């Protein structure tokens with residue numbers, strides 16, 4: 001599995017190049033894995049992945065929550081890996097063919113898929129939560145090795161860890177701004193994602209160091 | 219939304235030259251283009267403004283928005299800043315995520331389309347069982363524009379029943395995925411067509427042919 005420094009992944013959701021680069025550079029001594037999503041990509045272009053690699057040499061997870069039909073999913077994955085992303089995040093709720101399309105491209109291109117099972121926000125309870133255990137089991141059956149599950153619901157995160165097993169890699173958003181607890185989340189997740197609690201801080205480096213201090217025994 | 223010939227081009231070519239040429243070849247037949255991530259991630263968001271400059275077409279950004287509310291808001295803002303007239307949003311992540319998109323659309327003078335059931339086989343696993351409830355959620359939220367599947371006209375008809383004749387409904391899956399344009403337009407206001415046009419030997423003739431087949435509609 002990927003070796004994520006300090007079990008901490010930066011969610012870089014700032015929407016201009018200058019700020020995104022400044023903050024990422026400020027925390028680079030603490031974090032070697034950066035999640036780049038559509039807020040930044042749709043504002044600055046896919047070449048932002050190239051610039052981050054050039055400036056920081058951090059691993060890049062493209063958080064694109066891929067959620068289309070198989071044919072379109074393949075195109076999205078090919079474009080994303082072409083730009084230099086190490087991995088891409090894909091929704092499971094559109095079903096097994098859509099996930100398999102992404103897995104097939106990742107295999108061909110030598111990259112990785114993360115399967116998003118349950119989400120961390122309140123609305124996830126409406127439809128996603130009731131499908132999540134089955135989505136996870138589907139991932140295991142398809143050979144998925146990397147997963148995303150919610151920091152905001154420790155009980156659900158624990159179940160998802162059970163389903164995927166200890167050898168699978170699990171990352172988790174929702175600690176900090178959304179109310180999850182970093183230490184509790186790391187009982188089950190390999191790494192936590194942190195966005196606003198870092199990038200909105202007066203001193204992002206101090207914020208990152210503080211999160212790390214709070215989980216130092218882990 | 220007044221869609222010329224009830225036909226929306228799904229422009230999923232992945233290079234600018236081909237995308238512009240093919241769209242130009244069929245411009246006399248359409249005034250509405252759906253641009254998705256295959257083109258945007260290959261050529262950049264500036265492609266939307268370029269389509270508006272070249273064709274003066276309406277642009278639907280098919281971004282299948284499916285994040286938490288805070289991130290959805292950012293995605294919609296970036297998308298509308300790029301000149302999209304409308305954005306397609308998944309309903310599966312729940313009401314708060316949809317509302318976040320509705321808020322930005324209202325602020326910027328744009329439309330949200332709610333995707334309720336998808337057209338591909340995998341949709342049967344999780345989405346289909348939630349789809350009627352997703353549609354009722356749209357009604358509750360005041361959503362007026364919807365997407366449902368050409369490949370399952372009985373499901374498309376049910377979606378139309380739920381949202382009412384006043385709502386606007388567009389539908390992918392005719393052509394390449396096996397749906398029939400005419401049958402689909404019994405229930406949808408417009409059909410989406412991608413590969414059946416942009417991969418055809420002659421895209422203009424392909425568009426003309428689709429339109430000939432639904433001439434009475």
Ligand SMILES: O=c1cc(O)n([C@@H]2O[C@H](COP(=O)(O)O)[C@@H](O)[C@H]2O)c(=O)[nH]1
Nearest residue numbers: 011119120173177178194195196286289
């Ligand atoms: O279930 C999930 C899945 C996510 O990827 N995310 C993403 O993780 C990040 C959370 O950032 P924050 O720490 O600011 O709440 C955002 O990029 C969000 O889009 C999430 O919050 N919940």
Ligand SMILES: O=c1cc(O)n([C@@H]2O[C@H](COP(=O)(O)O)[C@@H](O)[C@H]2O)c(=O)[nH]1
Nearest residue numbers: 069072228336337390394395411412413
């Ligand atoms: O349920 C859905 C929803 C979609 O937006 N789409 C989109 O509609 C278009 C269908 O294109 P095509 O005619 O080549 O099958 C694609 O851009 C696809 O991403 C779909 O096929 N099924």
